[PDB]
Coordinates of all heavy atoms in Angstrom, one line a residue:
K92 N 0.8 -1.2 0.0 CA 0.0 0.0 0.0 C 0.9 1.3 0.0 O 0.5 2.3 -0.6 CB -0.9 0.0 1.2 CG -0.2 0.0 2.6 CD -1.2 -0.1 3.8 CE -0.5 -0.4 5.1 NZ -1.5 -0.7 6.2
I93 N 2.0 1.2 0.7 CA 2.9 2.4 0.7 C 3.4 2.6 -0.7 O 3.4 3.7 -1.3 CB 4.1 2.2 1.7 CG1 3.6 2.1 3.1 CG2 5.1 3.3 1.5 CD1 3.2 3.4 3.7
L94 N 3.9 1.5 -1.4 CA 4.5 1.7 -2.7 C 3.4 2.2 -3.7 O 3.7 3.0 -4.5 CB 5.0 0.3 -3.2 CG 6.2 -0.3 -2.3 CD1 6.5 -1.7 -2.8 CD2 7.4 0.6 -2.3
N95 N 2.2 1.6 -3.5 CA 1.1 2.1 -4.4 C 0.8 3.6 -4.2 O 0.5 4.3 -5.1 CB -0.2 1.3 -4.1 CG -0.1 -0.1 -4.6 OD1 0.8 -0.5 -5.4 ND2 -1.1 -1.0 -4.2
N96 N 0.8 4.0 -2.9 CA 0.4 5.4 -2.6 C 1.5 6.3 -3.2 O 1.1 7.4 -3.6 CB 0.3 5.6 -1.1 CG -1.0 4.9 -0.6 OD1 -1.9 4.4 -1.3 ND2 -1.1 4.8 0.8
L97 N 2.7 5.9 -3.2 CA 3.8 6.7 -3.8 C 3.9 6.6 -5.3 O 4.8 7.2 -5.9 CB 5.1 6.3 -3.2 CG 5.3 6.6 -1.7 CD1 6.5 6.0 -1.1 CD2 5.3 8.1 -1.5
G98 N 3.0 5.8 -6.0 CA 3.0 5.8 -7.4 C 4.0 4.8 -8.0 O 4.4 5.0 -9.2
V99 N 4.5 3.9 -7.3 CA 5.5 3.0 -7.8 C 4.9 2.1 -8.9 O 3.9 1.4 -8.7 CB 6.1 2.1 -6.7 CG1 7.0 1.0 -7.3 CG2 7.0 3.0 -5.8
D100 N 5.6 2.0 -10.0 CA 5.1 1.1 -11.2 C 5.8 -0.2 -11.3 O 5.3 -1.2 -11.8 CB 5.3 1.9 -12.5 CG 4.3 3.1 -12.6 OD1 3.1 2.9 -12.4 OD2 4.9 4.2 -12.8
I101 N 7.1 -0.3 -10.8 CA 8.0 -1.3 -11.1 C 9.1 -1.3 -10.2 O 9.4 -0.2 -9.6 CB 8.4 -1.2 -12.6 CG1 9.0 -2.5 -13.1 CG2 9.4 -0.1 -12.7 CD1 9.1 -2.5 -14.7
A102 N 9.8 -2.4 -10.0 CA 10.9 -2.5 -9.1 C 12.2 -2.8 -9.8 O 12.2 -3.5 -10.8 CB 10.7 -3.6 -8.0
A103 N 13.3 -2.2 -9.4 CA 14.6 -2.4 -10.0 C 15.2 -3.7 -9.5 O 15.6 -3.9 -8.3 CB 15.6 -1.3 -9.7
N104 N 15.2 -4.8 -10.4 CA 16.0 -6.0 -10.2 C 15.6 -6.8 -9.0 O 16.4 -7.4 -8.3 CB 17.5 -5.6 -10.1 CG 17.9 -4.8 -11.4 OD1 17.7 -3.6 -11.4 ND2 18.4 -5.6 -12.4
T105 N 14.3 -6.8 -8.7 CA 13.7 -7.6 -7.6 C 12.2 -7.8 -7.9 O 11.7 -7.1 -8.9 CB 14.0 -7.0 -6.3 OG1 13.5 -7.9 -5.2 CG2 13.2 -5.7 -6.1
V106 N 11.6 -8.6 -7.2 CA 10.1 -8.8 -7.2 C 9.6 -8.4 -5.8 O 9.9 -9.1 -4.9 CB 9.7 -10.2 -7.6 CG1 8.2 -10.4 -7.5 CG2 10.2 -10.5 -9.0
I107 N 8.7 -7.5 -5.8 CA 7.9 -7.3 -4.5 C 6.7 -8.1 -4.6 O 5.8 -7.9 -5.4 CB 7.5 -5.8 -4.3 CG1 8.8 -4.9 -4.4 CG2 6.8 -5.6 -3.0 CD1 9.8 -5.2 -3.2
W108 N 6.6 -9.2 -3.8 CA 5.5 -10.1 -3.9 C 4.4 -9.5 -3.0 O 4.6 -9.1 -1.9 CB 5.9 -11.5 -3.4 CG 4.8 -12.5 -3.7 CD1 3.9 -13.0 -2.7 CD2 4.4 -13.1 -4.9 NE1 3.0 -13.9 -3.3 CE2 3.3 -14.0 -4.7 CE3 4.9 -13.0 -6.2 CZ2 2.8 -14.8 -5.7 CZ3 4.3 -13.8 -7.2 CH2 3.3 -14.7 -6.9
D109 N 3.2 -9.5 -3.6 CA 2.0 -8.9 -2.9 C 1.2 -10.1 -2.2 O 0.5 -10.8 -2.9 CB 1.1 -8.2 -3.9 CG -0.1 -7.5 -3.2 OD1 -0.4 -7.9 -2.0 OD2 -0.6 -6.5 -3.8
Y110 N 1.5 -10.3 -0.9 CA 0.9 -11.4 -0.2 C -0.6 -11.2 0.1 O -1.3 -12.2 0.3 CB 1.7 -11.6 1.1 CG 3.0 -12.2 1.0 CD1 4.2 -11.5 0.8 CD2 3.1 -13.6 1.1 CE1 5.4 -12.2 0.7 CE2 4.3 -14.3 1.0 CZ 5.5 -13.5 0.8 OH 6.7 -14.2 0.6
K111 N -1.1 -10.0 0.0 CA -2.5 -9.9 0.2 C -3.3 -10.3 -1.1 O -4.4 -10.8 -1.0 CB -2.9 -8.5 0.7 CG -2.3 -8.3 2.1 CD -2.9 -7.3 2.9 CE -2.4 -7.3 4.3 NZ -0.9 -7.1 4.3
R112 N -2.7 -10.1 -2.2 CA -3.3 -10.6 -3.5 C -2.7 -11.9 -3.9 O -3.3 -12.5 -4.8 CB -3.0 -9.6 -4.6 CG -3.8 -8.2 -4.5 CD -3.2 -7.1 -5.5 NE -3.2 -7.6 -6.9 CZ -2.0 -7.8 -7.6 NH1 -0.8 -7.5 -7.0 NH2 -2.1 -8.3 -8.8
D113 N -1.7 -12.4 -3.3 CA -1.0 -13.7 -3.7 C -0.6 -13.6 -5.2 O -0.8 -14.5 -6.0 CB -2.0 -14.8 -3.5 CG -1.4 -16.2 -3.6 OD1 -0.1 -16.3 -3.6 OD2 -2.1 -17.2 -3.7
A114 N 0.1 -12.5 -5.5 CA 0.5 -12.1 -6.9 C 1.6 -11.1 -6.8 O 1.9 -10.5 -5.8 CB -0.7 -11.6 -7.7
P115 N 2.3 -10.9 -7.9 CA 3.3 -9.8 -8.0 C 2.7 -8.5 -7.7 O 1.6 -8.2 -8.2 CB 4.0 -9.9 -9.4 CG 3.5 -11.2 -9.9 CD 2.2 -11.5 -9.2
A116 N 3.4 -7.6 -7.0 CA 2.9 -6.2 -6.8 C 2.8 -5.5 -8.1 O 2.0 -4.6 -8.3 CB 3.7 -5.5 -5.8
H117 N 3.7 -5.8 -9.0 CA 3.9 -5.0 -10.3 C 3.8 -6.0 -11.4 O 4.1 -7.1 -11.4 CB 5.2 -4.2 -10.2 CG 5.3 -3.4 -9.0 ND1 6.3 -3.6 -8.0 CD2 4.6 -2.4 -8.5 CE1 6.1 -2.8 -7.0 NE2 5.0 -2.0 -7.3
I118 N 3.3 -5.5 -12.6 CA 3.0 -6.4 -13.7 C 4.3 -6.7 -14.4 O 4.4 -7.9 -14.9 CB 2.0 -5.7 -14.6 CG1 1.6 -6.7 -15.7 CG2 2.5 -4.3 -15.1 CD1 1.0 -8.0 -15.2
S119 N 5.2 -5.8 -14.5 CA 6.4 -6.0 -15.3 C 7.6 -6.0 -14.4 O 7.5 -5.6 -13.2 CB 6.6 -4.9 -16.3 OG 5.6 -5.1 -17.3
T120 N 8.8 -6.4 -14.9 CA 10.0 -6.5 -14.1 C 11.1 -5.9 -14.8 O 11.1 -5.6 -16.0 CB 10.3 -8.0 -13.8 OG1 10.2 -8.8 -15.0 CG2 9.2 -8.5 -12.8

C-alpha cells in the first residue's frame, strides 16, 4: 500500500510479492 500510494510502477532488479493478493505487486519486471 505504501508503494502504491507513492505511485511505484515497477521494481529495480527484484520482485515485490503482494501477499494480500497472492501475486506480484507489479506487472512487469
